[PDB]
Assembly symmetry: D3
Homo-oligomer: 79 residues x 6
């Protein structure tokens, strides 16, 4: 199921969540950011305009009017 | 010519445009984001502070006071 | 020392600094963005929510209430 | 294979080889765009591809050589 | 090696080889996650790893083959 | 070649090899910084480079070996 893989994906890859403005910042272990962010893309979050992954960090762009914090809180509750 | 390659680059790589705040979000096919964003860099958009590409997503930072939307609308009109 | 490597890292990799909103934009030579941004991560800037590197560009997310500009000015003074 | 042909025309700056690897050079940032499409084709002789920024390493399946794999890509 | 075993179970879609290279295929974006962990293990026979997006090239140390290195990874 | 020499001093943590590949290890995120500069040099014996995060695969042109290509880079 998708909710279960989202839960396990976040359980295993989300080291921390942070935010500023319209951006939620996801911290992963090394190399984990593209792995996590690709999955987030594919679960189809309406509040998520898009994501970009580097190596251990993902920037999640919140759809207006939702904030980075509120977006990050959503994802944390999926854990 | 540069306008023609910008037009064809956007025609072939820009799956969709979105925006939030000062960020225009470009969606590409798989692997296309660095290809597209590098070219955007090199055409020298004054309104563009910079770009970062992941795999299929580019975040374009709009130069103040222009918005992500207005930046995205500019690029769409180049199509 | 860390301040010295931050100084030399910035001296050799920071082509330019820019900003918009809460994002400081770092420009590097080709391939230099992950090299620079990883180091910035590891020096532990409280004002820095996180960073993402592409190839020659880094987006540094400023911790509220600090701005991208103020964040970029901090880093420039480390040069 | 009509789509791969346009993909190579627009992205393949050069093809080289050594041993069992064919190397593709692209314009900047083009490597994962080209290489992911090659994966999608799914050729039996391609063990795998790695994309950097403007270079793709394509591993040829033994006993095919990287020179042979590069010639097929250069053909298309 | 208990952590690598879970890492491979969750990320290793397939393993292939040619010459002295073992190729790991992962779900999308999984390659640098898997490959950095492999580096961390630090096996003597692994000369190095490169991660793309969903493919990892693992270079086997002579005289070990990529087939042999892939079998050890497939084992775990 | 004076710039490559400083580039290697600051970024080359180690050099290894297997078959026709020289492997460069860098500090974290250093691989595309080093590798793009190597491309820029444009050595005839370098068929191509791929950068991951901290590892660069440099493919040696036959009949040169990756050991030989790594020794030249280690020299500089
Ligand atoms: N955190 C930044 C910088 C970074 C780059 C490479 C690394 O290996 C680690 C960190 C990113 O993920 O893009
Ligand atoms: N869209 C994000 C996450 C992603 C990563 C890897 C992919 O293959 C696909 C998507 C990015 O481009 O960074
Ligand atoms: N500046 C953008 C786009 C880019 C991608 C690849 C390049 O080689 C150059 C530029 C980034 O660093 O992500
Ligand atoms: N050609 C190598 C090195 C490189 C890295 C980054 C670049 O922008 C350019 C070249 C690769 O694509 O991995
Ligand atoms: N399999 C290759 C090509 C690729 C690039 C980007 C992708 O999203 C998917 C595949 C790699 O991982 O480098
Ligand atoms: N050494 C491999 C795997 C790796 C990936 C990401 C890292 O942050 C570290 C290592 C590479 O650079 O591709
Ligand atoms: Na890392
Ligand atoms: Na990136
Ligand atoms: Na993709
Ligand atoms: Na570049």
């Amino acid at each position: 199921g998708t909710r279960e893989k989202l839960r396990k994906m976040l359980d295993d890859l989300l080291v921390s969540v942070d935010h500023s403005g319209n951006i939620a910042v996801l911290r992963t272990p090394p190399g984990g950011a593209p792995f996590l962010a690709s999955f987030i893309d594919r679960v189809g979050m309406e509040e998520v305009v898009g994501t970009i992954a580097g190596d251990d960090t993902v920037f999640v762009l919140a759809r207006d009017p939702m904030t980075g914090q509120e977006l990050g809180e959503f994802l944390s509750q999926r854990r």
